[PDB]
Amino acid sequence: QLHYTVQEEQEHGTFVGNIAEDLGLDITKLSARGFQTVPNSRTPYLDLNLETGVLYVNEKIDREQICKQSPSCVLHLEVFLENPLELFQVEIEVLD
Amino acid sequence: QLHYTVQEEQEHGTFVGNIAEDLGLDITKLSARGFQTVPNSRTPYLDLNLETGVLYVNEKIDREQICKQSPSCVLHLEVFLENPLELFQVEIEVLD
Amino acid sequence: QLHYTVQEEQEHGTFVGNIAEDLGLDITKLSARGFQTVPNSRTPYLDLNLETGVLYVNEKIDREQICKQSPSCVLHLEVFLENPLELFQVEIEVLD
Amino acid sequence: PGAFGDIQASSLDATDIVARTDIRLLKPSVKNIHVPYTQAVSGYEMWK
Amino acid sequence: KFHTVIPSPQVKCCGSLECKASSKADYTCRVFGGVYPFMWGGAQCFCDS
Amino acid sequence: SITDDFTLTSPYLGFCPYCRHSTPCFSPIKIENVWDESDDGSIRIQVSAQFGYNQAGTADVTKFRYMSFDHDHDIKEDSMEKIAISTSGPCRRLGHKGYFLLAQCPPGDSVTVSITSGASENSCTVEKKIRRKFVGREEYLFPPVHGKLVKCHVYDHLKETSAGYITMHRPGPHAYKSYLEEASGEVYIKPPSGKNVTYECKCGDYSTGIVSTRTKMNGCTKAKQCIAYKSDQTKWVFNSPDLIRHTDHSVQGKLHIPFRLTPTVCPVPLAHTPTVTKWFKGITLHLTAMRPTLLTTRKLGLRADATAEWITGS
Amino acid sequence: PTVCPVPLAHTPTVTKWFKGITLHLTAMRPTLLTTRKLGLRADATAEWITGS
Amino acid sequence: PPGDSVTVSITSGASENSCTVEKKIRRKFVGREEYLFPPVHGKLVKCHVYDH
């Protein structure tokens, strides 16, 4: 569905991608469609920016803790909009 | 319900407690009420004395074997009487 | 039911036993009764000879692979005939 | 008790609530410590 | 749907208690006789009835 | 106000109906409530320990603190790798904070919480009905990939969400039998080293006092005439039905209930279009359905004549 | 032989009319009910009950 | 727990095996009310069990 890759040892908000730009849904209108993160999602490490549709990095990435529970080191996240309703998927992977 | 503690390396019947004395039910009468051990009980290591309500120690205590099956090293035991019917609980712990 | 033993390090078809001879059902007639191996059987290592009822050895025996899945190192095999219908069992064991 | 409208109030955050749920208290049998009770089912769930 | 809240009981060793009245929803109260209750450390009063 | 300083609170221990074997016991992981009002099966659990904080109260996401089965009744700690939940099989752990947990479980009839291998292993089970639920007018096992989008309500996975509060009080008395002694018709009082303990006795008149070393209560002859407990307990506890209250049972603080209920969107399946046959003043519908489905009709005149039926097969 | 503990149900409420009664019951699992008449005829009943 | 068969097996080691036998095993209760667990507040009656 979507695929971005993050490097080891990030420093609280460098850059990941540009969701609204790759999905074509345009800026200056999504502020009213209801742009939101899904409650069944949202790993603690990343953060959204409802205005310009870019992905942060919240706290420093730690490979040891992150894929001690899901051996394939990946991260899951979803977003949705209204009028009319949609549902998208994003995956992030930690390199070395 | 009740709580007594036994030391390591006992020698076949030193002392543990006094059940009838702590529970208030008096001597000289319990010999007829039907003082008994419950068949769903009775670890091999301890023994009762239906007359004076004291707890023995039957065979020498071995920490290695005793809590190789229940990591919290404890021991369970119950007693009951009749006319009218009752049901009490006792727990013993092995120290070091 | 039946019991034969095979030695380690065989070389593609030495000898195991003689099934039809031990079971008494005679030669020169079983070629028409429908002598067959059962599809729910047939370890890869052994082979039948529908004419003279003897057991081969197909590929070299390897104790490491053979009883890494069934610790009691044994092997199973069945045969059946028609007019009228029968069902027999054979077991083979790997020595050292 | 046992039907729609066994608990009532004028708003969700108010302070004056009335109800009738048929609750009665019993005497302890085993002597550790606790309080036993019995009660009727909620009429809201029965209406659904 | 409702939620039944049951507070922590109070005991008086060898005196006596009686009930007041309050405004909460469906209030209920009762008093009981000689009991002698127990917790992990053991017996909790000093008059045995 | 509502606070978040967990250095002013402490865990306790209760009375579980079904301990490890069958007997009732005193346990450090008693289960108070369960809640299952969500739309994808999740449930919320309240227990008697404190998850996510270290031995002194500060926060870290790998530890928890509990109360002790031993000598000297303090607080102890261990790592979260030892917590498990089950109804009929194992469940997945989704979040944790304070007295609260969140999990996702298959159908069954009971709920269990256990501390796996290590010192102080235990469990506790509670009766509760848990079945499968669906949203819409068609049944499904999984949410399919081609369908419509409707509205639903679920439990949030974050922990800073709120749904209410709970109250905290001052801890009452707790008497230990070990502090008493008896030597040839005299009764003594034995404190743990260098701490203040309070006694209270009646073998005649009333008597109290605070001591710090072995002391002789004059007048009494048996051991079941006094009690004693220790007298510095400024840590708050929950209003639980398995404790004894203080002389001052007034509220001293409030605490949050995480894992709010929010609205979201959900996908649902679409059935197979039927075929119609026409005759004089009527129709006939040839239907297909491999799971239960719904059908409703009404008439557009002064009378309604409503119907309703769940259908299976062709 | 030994001893075993068993549960106790929820006390019912009764309504009185001319030569009869009505019992309002509550049961979250199956439970039993038995009646008989104290005269020359018995007229026994028996039923397992679930619900309210 | 309930089921329809009974099994006995020697786990890992030389000479591993098992054996299964058909048998009906269900849940049973004592008295006039059903329960999953023996509760904590109730009455006391007579029962018969296997000695340990």
Q: Please answer yes or no on whether B72 and F119 come within 8 Å at the CB atom.
A: yes
Q: Which amino acid, residue F93?
A: R
CA C22, CA C20: separation in Å to the nearest integer?
Answer: 6
User: Which residues contact residue H22 at a Cβ distance below 8 angstroms, ignoring those fewer than 6 apart?
Assistant: H4, H5
CB of F149 within 8 Å of a chain A CB? The answer is yes
Q: State how far residue D24 is from chain G, nearest Cα, in angstroms.
A: 9
B71, B76, B89: residue with CB nearest F121: B71
Q: To which residue do tokens 């949203």 refer? A: F135
Instruction: Give kind and range of the element (H or E) at residue G16.
Output: strand G13-17
CB of F114 within 8 Å of a chain B CB? The answer is no
CB of F310 within 8 Å of a chain D CB? The answer is no
Q: Work out how many CB contacts closer than 8 A connect B with E.
A: 6
CA E22, CA H1: separation in Å to the nearest integer?
Answer: 49
CA G7, CA F195: separation in Å to the nearest integer?
Answer: 46
Residue of C86, C8, C18 whose CA lies nearest to C45: C8
F15 to chain H: closest CA residue: H40
Residue of F20, F108, F125, F136 whose CA lies nearest to F69: F20
Q: Please answer yes or no on whether F264 and A39 come within 8 Å at the CB atom.
A: yes
Length, in residues, of chain D: 48
CA E36, CA E44: separation in Å to the nearest integer?
Answer: 7
Q: State how far residue F36 is from chain D, nearest Cα, in angstroms.
A: 14
Write out the two tokens for G13: 């409420």
CA A73, CA A66: separation in Å to the nearest integer?
Answer: 7
> Which alpha helices (H) appear in chain D, and where do they start and end?
43-47
F154, F158, F265: residue with CB nearest A85: F265
Task: Specify the resolution in Å.
Answer: 3.0
Q: Please answer yes or no on whether H52 and B40 come within 8 Å at the CB atom.
A: yes
Q: State how far residue C63 is from chain H, nearest Cα, in angstroms.
A: 14
The distance of Cα F253 from the centroid of its chain, to the nearest Å, equals 20
Beta-strand relationship, B36-37 and B74-80: antiparallel
Which string of DSSP letters, residue by residue, matches A34-96?
A: T-EE-SS---TT----TTT-B----S---HHHHTSSSSS-EEEEEEE-TTTT--EEEEEEE--
CB of H28 within 8 Å of a chain G CB? The answer is no
Q: To which residue do tokens 């030994």 refer? A: G2
User: Which residues contact residue E16 at a Cβ distance below 8 angstroms, ignoring those fewer than 6 apart?
Assistant: none
Write out the two tokens for F194: 């260098």
Torsion of the alpha carbons at D35, D41, D44 and E1, rounded to the nearest 10: 10
CA A37, CA A49: separation in Å to the nearest integer?
Answer: 10
DSSP E15: S
Q: Please answer yes or no on whether D35 and F241 come within 8 Å at the CB atom.
A: yes
CB of F27 within 8 Å of a chain H CB? The answer is no
CA H14, CA G49: separation in Å to the nearest integer?
Answer: 56
G4, G9, G32: residue with CB nearest H30: G4
D12-21: which pairs have CB atoms within 8 A and are 24 or more residues apart?
D17/E25, D18/E25, D19/E2, D19/E25, D19/E26, D20/E26, D21/E2, D21/E26
User: Measured between beta carbons, which residues in chain E are less than 8 angstroms from residue D27?
Assistant: 32
Distance separating the N- and C-terminal Cα atoms of chain F: 62
Q: State how far residue B96 is from chain G, nearest Cα, in angstroms.
A: 36
User: Which residues contact residue F177 at a Cβ distance below 8 angstroms, ignoring those fewer than 6 apart?
Assistant: E41, E42, E43
CA F148, CA F129: separation in Å to the nearest integer?
Answer: 30
Write out the two tokens for E24: 């909460």
Q: Where does residue F101 rank: exposed (0-12), middle (13-18), buried (19+ CB within 10 A)? A: buried
Residue of F191, F218, F216 whose CA lies nearest to F203: F218
User: Measured between beta carbons, which residues in chain D are less than 8 angstroms from residue E35?
Assistant: 28, 31
The distance of Cα C14 from the centroid of its chain, to the nearest Å, equals 13
Write out the two tokens for F63: 């530890």
Q: Please answer yes or no on whether F240 and E40 come within 8 Å at the CB atom.
A: no
User: Measured between beta carbons, which residues in chain E are less than 8 angstroms from residue D31?
Assistant: 35-38
The HSE-up count of residue F301 (CA atoms within 13 Å, CB side) is 2
User: Measured between beta carbons, which residues in chain D are less than 8 angstroms from residue F174?
Assistant: none
In this structure, are residues E38 and E44 in contact, taking their beta carbons and an 8 Å threshold? yes
Burial G3-37 (b: 16+ CB within 10 A, else e): bbbbbebbeeeeeeeeeeeeeeebbeeebeeeeee
DSSP F6: G
CA F178, CA F190: separation in Å to the nearest integer?
Answer: 8
Per DSSP, what are the bridge partners of residue F50?
Answer: F65
Q: Work out how many CB contacts closer than 8 A connect D with F.
A: 10
CB of F244 within 8 Å of a chain D CB? The answer is yes
Write out the two tokens for F274: 């039927």
The HSE-up count of residue F105 (CA atoms within 13 Å, CB side) is 27
Q: Please answer yes or no on whether B39 and H49 come within 8 Å at the CB atom.
A: yes
The distance of Cα F15 from the centroid of its chain, to the nearest Å, equals 14
CA B93, CA B73: separation in Å to the nearest integer?
Answer: 6
User: Which residues contact residue F287 at a Cβ distance below 8 angstroms, ignoring those fewer than 6 apart?
Assistant: F274, F295, F311, F314
CA F226, CA F200: separation in Å to the nearest integer?
Answer: 6
Q: Please answer yes or no on whether E4 and D45 come within 8 Å at the CB atom.
A: no
Angle at alpha carbon of residue F72, lines to F68 and F73, rounded to 5° = 40
CA B50, CA B40: separation in Å to the nearest integer?
Answer: 18
B24, B70, B89: residue with CB nearest F23: B89
CA D32, CA E36: separation in Å to the nearest integer?
Answer: 9
Beta-strand relationship, A3-6 and A88-94: parallel
In this structure, are residues F120 and F27 in contact, taking their beta carbons and an 8 Å threshold? no
Write out the two tokens for C76: 């199973």
CA F50, CA F55: separation in Å to the nearest integer?
Answer: 10
CA F109, CA H2: separation in Å to the nearest integer?
Answer: 14
CA E36, CA B22: separation in Å to the nearest integer?
Answer: 12
CA F63, CA G51: separation in Å to the nearest integer?
Answer: 45
CB of C70 within 8 Å of a chain H CB? The answer is yes
User: Which residues contact residue H16 at a Cβ distance below 8 angstroms, ignoring those fewer than 6 apart?
Assistant: C70, C71, C72, H9, H10
Q: Please answer yes or no on whether E48 and B1 come within 8 Å at the CB atom.
A: no
Write out the two tokens for E45: 């009063």
Phi–psi pair at F13, nearest 5 degrees: -145, 145
Collapse the DSSP code of B65 into the 3-class scheme (helix H, G, I; strand E, B; otherwise coil) and give the result: helix
Angle at alpha carbon of residue F101, lines to F96 and F107, rounded to 5° = 135
In this structure, are residues F168 and F207 in contact, taking their beta carbons and an 8 Å threshold? no
User: Which residues contact residue B13 at a Cβ distance below 8 angstroms, ignoring those fewer than 6 apart?
Assistant: B47, B56, B57, B58
User: Which residues contact residue B29 at a Cβ distance below 8 angstroms, ignoring those fewer than 6 apart?
Assistant: none
Q: Where does residue F91 rank: exposed (0-12), middle (13-18), buried (19+ CB within 10 A)? A: buried
CA F47, CA G46: separation in Å to the nearest integer?
Answer: 43
User: Which residues contact residue H28 at a Cβ distance below 8 angstroms, ignoring those fewer than 6 apart?
Assistant: none
Alpha-carbon distances of F269 from F40, F148, F274, H6, H30, rounded to whole Å: 16, 7, 16, 43, 47
Residue of B35, B77, B75 whose CA lies nearest to B52: B35
CB of E42 within 8 Å of a chain B CB? The answer is yes
Q: Tally Cβ neighbours within 10 Å of residue A77.
A: 20
User: Measured between beta carbons, which residues in chain F are less than 8 angstroms from residue A84?
Assistant: 149
Which string of DSSP letters, residue by residue, matches H1-52?
A: --EEEEEEEE-SSSS-EEEEEEEEE-----SSB--SS--SS-EEEEE-----
DSSP F177: G
B93 to chain F: closest CA residue: F70
Q: To which residue do tokens 């309240």 refer? A: F46
B87 to chain H: closest CA residue: H44
CA dihedral for H42, H46, H47, H52, sign (positive or negative): positive
User: Measured between beta carbons, which residues in chain B are less than 8 angstroms from residue H51?
Assistant: 39
E36, E38, E48: residue with CB nearest B1: E38
Write out the two tokens for F25: 């016991």
> Before A84, cis peptide (omega within 30)?
yes
CA dihedral for F216, F218, F220, F225, sign (positive or negative): negative
Q: Tally Cβ neighbours within 10 Å of residue B79.
A: 21
